[PDB]
Ligand binder design. Structure first.
Ligand SMILES: [Cl-]
Ligand SMILES: [Cl-]
Ligand SMILES: [Cl-]
Ligand SMILES: [Cl-]
Lengths: 369, 372
């Protein structure tokens, strides 16, 4: 029904496994804050978060207030951190929906407080990224943010720039961020302040800097069982299992003669008489065009032929037995002994895993496995 | 509220201008078939299609039955053609929602007929694209499709591979596609068949093969006032105006000391003391990550602000060192006009090493859509 054309399959057993692996890898006092922004990295925000809350995960991060509001509507009662700027004009909603707001700088905190609504917040410290956050130099402003009447600071955090790299430049830069971050905490304590919940790590924060002990780890990619690049060399090597697979049903099969093409592409000319299968998936569904690469059918590799179109693409099934309309093609996922992983696809599309997954088309039905 | 973060702005006046400009280039009896698949090429299917019907467009094409059903729920009452496969198991919905189905091949046609539901259809003929459609060889299967009890064939059509190209080889292939198509029609006629409505052209079919005489033209990119690339000299040169703008409001301004980076990516090291504006739009919103590191700029206060560092999932950074009129809340134009400056969808698509169709159809679902 949802499985007639193209669809995403999410393996909740794999997600559940990942949650447990991640939790086990963390310090006992550290909690999993599941990053579910942009439709849970394309995995489906309702599907993922309701299930996560159901198996014990009790902390979430989203990009925007509307994301966070969606979660509340879904029934999510765990705490939720909005990672981005929310306009102060929506302070009543931060209050009503009990959404935890990131304080991006002192001015913003001031304007947010001025709105007059009691709001839970985490303060972001810019430790080198130079996007959002209070600077490590402006310690009086950071401290001042703790004495705002309507702003209940429940946490303090930063974001690492190059935790996914073991290059000495990136290591020194990562340590510099970690170091200046804890110097902020030292300074605050020196001024009598009690430190709230601390978080520093994303996925590669855990993977390459497991010696860190914070109150949460913000897990995105690792939670979904994928790596950012194919075969990375992390300190930890966790048994993470891919949650997402992408499938499409063959809708038509045709013969083309030797010397013919598909879509009249300069790139493809049949070297023999060939059998072509049509799959109802294209770039509008988030399968990248510049892969104009194979799919798996019957555990076999069927090369994509011709350019990828908006709503469909073609594959060569000449060498593959028992292919008919209704046969399931695997664009991302396992098929018997063969596997096409998300990072593999991202890589050949000259992209990273995060972009490929988070840009899965809204048109794709999502179903449980 | 819908303008607080990042949003698309749809110029309905420009869209209406396009509809008129396009109809003018058409034969009087030829009807505009507005192609509104993939959220109307990212423009917002609800916004665009209701307005199109309001201004008198009476024919729509979608990619899937679920798009077609959505149109019906939006109050669309005009005919709708589903261009791609629809599971025969949903023949009841095709019937109930009065959707017209593309016959993608003979076997499909038979199977849909056997469902027992009265369904309107257009038969597709493969004339060289070699994706969907009945082959030109199998003349008898085509004629047989005109004798199915529950399928009423109301049209017959094909797609041109390269109508957008005026190169020798390409023009030749297009002409043989057209020739093959009418050969089928002649053969059908000879078999005592009265031909239904015909359509062969998409946007470039109209622009580059205007001499064709059909009952519909399926207009996609032209309707949205963008041409898939820049800048082909088409046979007709129509006055088409861009419908879509992409906008985002600055959420922070940061001083960057000379020597410092943004996001530590060696992609950017300031050569001077700089001002950086942070925009709450990223690649998850459909703004392609390969636009990173100066591969595009945005418009702020009518001036160009180059993108600095890598584009993130939900945010990016631009250089406003030379634009004093930038504050929290300032509108950045990523696609569209500002002051006397313009950054068009085709320019952005070229920068992204892509094409307009892909850039636009892949606009993120998270973006708010506002009519203008
Ligand atoms: Cl940030
Ligand atoms: Cl990290
Ligand atoms: Cl086709
Ligand atoms: Cl065309």
């Amino acid at each position: 029904a949802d499985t007639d054309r193209a669809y995403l399959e999410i393996n909740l057993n794999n997600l559940e496994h990942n949650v447990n692996t991640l939790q086990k890898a963390m310090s006992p006092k550290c909690e999993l804050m599941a990053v579910v922004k942009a439709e849970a990295y394309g995995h489906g925000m309702y599907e993922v978060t309701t299930y996560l809350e159901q198996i014990g995960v009790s902390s979430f991060a989203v990009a925007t207030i509307d994301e966070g509001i969606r979660l509340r509507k879904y029934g999510i009662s765990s705490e939720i951190l909005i990672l981005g700027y929310t306009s102060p004009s929506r302070a009543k909603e931060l209050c009503k929906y009990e959404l935890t707001q990131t304080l991006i700088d002192y001015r913003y905190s001031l304007l947010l407080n001025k709105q007059g609504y009691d709001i839970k917040a985490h303060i972001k410290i810019d430790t080198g990224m130079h996007r959002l956050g209070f600077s490590t130099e402006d310690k009086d402003k950071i401290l001042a943010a703790f004495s705002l009447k309507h702003i209940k600071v429940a946490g303090i955090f930063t974001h690492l720039c190059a935790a996914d790299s073991l290059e000495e430049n990136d290591v020194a830069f990562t340590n510099k961020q970690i170091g200046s971050f804890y110097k902020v905490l030292d300074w605050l304590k020196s001024s009598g302040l009690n430190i709230p919940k601390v978080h520093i790590q994303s996925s590669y924060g855990l993977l390459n800097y497991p010696e860190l002990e914070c109150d949460y780890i913000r897990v995105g990619v690792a939670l979904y069982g994928v790596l950012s690049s194919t075969n990375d060399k992390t300190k930890l090597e966790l048994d993470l299992r891919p949650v997402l697979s992408l499938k499409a049903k063959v809708v038509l099969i045709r013969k083309i003669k030797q010397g013919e093409s598909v879509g009249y592409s300069r790139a493809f000319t049949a070297t023999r008489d060939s059998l072509i299968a049509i799959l109802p998936i294209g770039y509008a569904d988030g399968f990248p065009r510049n892969l104009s690469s194979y799919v798996l059918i019957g555990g076999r590799q069927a090369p994509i032929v011709g350019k990828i179109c908006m709503d469909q693409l073609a594959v060569d099934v000449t060498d593959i037995p028992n292919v008919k309309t209704g046969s399931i093609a695997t664009l991302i996922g396992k098929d018997g002994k063969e596997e096409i992983t998300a990072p593999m696809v991202a890589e050949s599309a000259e992209s990273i895993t995060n972009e490929l997954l988070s840009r899965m088309g809204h048109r794709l039905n999502i179903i449980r496995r």
